[PDB]
């Protein structure tokens, strides 16, 4: 599309998210969600093809259903108490409806089915935007009402999301579906600490956003969407493969990388609340995410796959466009463990 139109649509998406984040009236939060949904579709459908159209219509259906459920929860809350402010929910039924709507917006299990297909359909830039920016508003809404959530339902869907992501990432060869399942697992990790501490949720969100930005920018730099296509990256730009391997190790939670910070802090916080079994199961399940990260690293950088003859022309050319902040994102997603006590800033 026209660059002016694209910039306006991106600004509208961001302004809808900010409207959700800064408003204190439930109707304004709903309006922000509607504005974000309205401006999101052309971004996903920027490169016109049947796959993008199918992904866009699936995303539209899911988000419209979630918004309708959220509106119903708001109306029930208003019925049982003449309040519009985002505070304690005031009703057991209203809270359940709202939690399911926000889980559907976030993609938490069992409402995860749309994320892998929407990510596969859209391009890598739309996938980056969808998996990074489209998590801020629902998570902020969940944080604002964290004192109302029933811990059983939140913990159940969090553990389900972790298990589903771990199991579903094992079966994928497409990189975008791998990233989608990783996002589902990380969402499950994020929502398992909302009943106890929202600062841990925000810290995990920041770390995951940095890691996902680094990974998607690396994937865009080496234009590969399949495992075998990424297996050709060493023959042209081995530094990109080495950085990608380090980032993958970080995303698996291996210390002393940055990705070890959120799991460590969440486990410690959950143990402070006399919860022992769930962190153990969560780490055991994150082992699966680490396994398929290791498989990707094996196929990418730790071994050398066969190449083709036509790579000799690619050897002669350099990337016309260089993405700013890629170096900063890699460093932030790799080497910030010693700066852990900085989380007291209420990030």
């Amino acid at each position: 599309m026209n660059p002016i139109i694209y910039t306006t649509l991106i600004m509208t998406v961001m302004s809808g998210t900010m409207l959700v984040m800064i408003s204190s009236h439930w109707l304004l939060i709903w309006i922000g969600f509607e504005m974000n949904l309205l401006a999101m579709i052309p971004v996903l459908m920027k490169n016109f093809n049947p796959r993008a159209t199918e992904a866009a219509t699936k995303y539209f259906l899911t988000q419209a259903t979630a918004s309708m459920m959220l509106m119903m929860a708001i109306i029930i809350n208003l019925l049982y108490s003449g309040q519009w402010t985002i505070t304690k929910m005031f009703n057991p039924v209203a809270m359940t409806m709202m939690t399911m709507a926000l889980a559907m917006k976030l993609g938490l299990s069992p409402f995860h089915f749309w994320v892998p297909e929407v990510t596969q359909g859209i391009s890598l830039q739309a996938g980056l935007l969808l998996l990074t920016w489209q998590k801020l508003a629902p998570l902020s809404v969940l944080c604002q009402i964290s004192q109302s959530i029933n811990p059983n339902l939140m913990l159940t869907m969090a553990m389900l999301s972790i298990l589903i992501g771990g199991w579903g990432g094992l079966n994928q060869t497409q990189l975008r579906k791998i990233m989608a399942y990783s996002s589902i697992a990380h969402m499950g990790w994020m929502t398992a600490v909302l009943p106890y501490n929202t600062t841990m949720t925000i810290l995990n969100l920041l770390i995951y956003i940095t890691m996902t930005l680094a990974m998607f920018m690396l994937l865009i730099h080496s234009s590969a969407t399949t495992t075998l296509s990424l297996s050709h990256t060493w023959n042209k730009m081995p530094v990109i493969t080495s950085l990608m391997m380090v980032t993958l190790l970080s995303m698996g939670g291996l210390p002393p990388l940055s990705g070890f910070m959120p799991k460590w802090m969440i486990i410690q916080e959950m143990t402070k609340n006399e919860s022992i079994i769930m962190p153990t199961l969560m780490a055991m399940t994150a082992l699966l995410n680490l396994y398929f990260y290791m498989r990707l690293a094996y196929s990418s950088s730790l071994t050398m796959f066969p190449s083709t003859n036509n790579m000799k022309m690619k050897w002669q050319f350099e990337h016309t466009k260089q993405m700013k902040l890629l170096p900063t994102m890699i460093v932030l997603s790799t080497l910030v463990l010693p700066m852990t006590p900085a989380l007291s800033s209420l990030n």
């Binding site: 309205l38 199918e54 866009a56 539209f60 419209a64 029930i76 049982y80 297909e117 359909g121």
Partner: protein, 98 residues
């Protein structure tokens, strides 16, 4: 909470279930979504009028406008899908899979 509110909530639940069934015909999915927003409009209007909360007489109008805009967006998406496949059948959207 009297019986009229229960009837409207039952209508909303029926519309949501009908949306979640998907026999076929994505147009029926859009119809179920619009039935849901209509039920929301009715029940919110009843709540607002019963309690004499003057300033929320705006809100049903805003809800209607936004939901109709979403309806137009969904109709455009359905038209594009139909032009791609020749029909609005749900089962034709199987290119992307888990």
């Amino acid at each position: 909470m009297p019986l009229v509110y229960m009837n409207i909530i039952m209508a909303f639940a029926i519309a949501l279930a009908g949306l979640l069934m998907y026999r076929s015909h994505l147009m029926s999915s859009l119809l179920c979504l619009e039935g849901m927003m209509l039920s929301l409009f009715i029940m919110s209007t009843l709540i607002i009028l019963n309690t004499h909360f003057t300033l929320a007489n705006m809100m049903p109008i805003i809800l209607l406008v936004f939901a109709a805009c979403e309806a137009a967006l969904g109709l455009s998406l359905l038209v594009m899908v139909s032009n791609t496949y020749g029909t609005d059948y749900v089962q034709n959207l199987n290119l992307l899979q888990c």
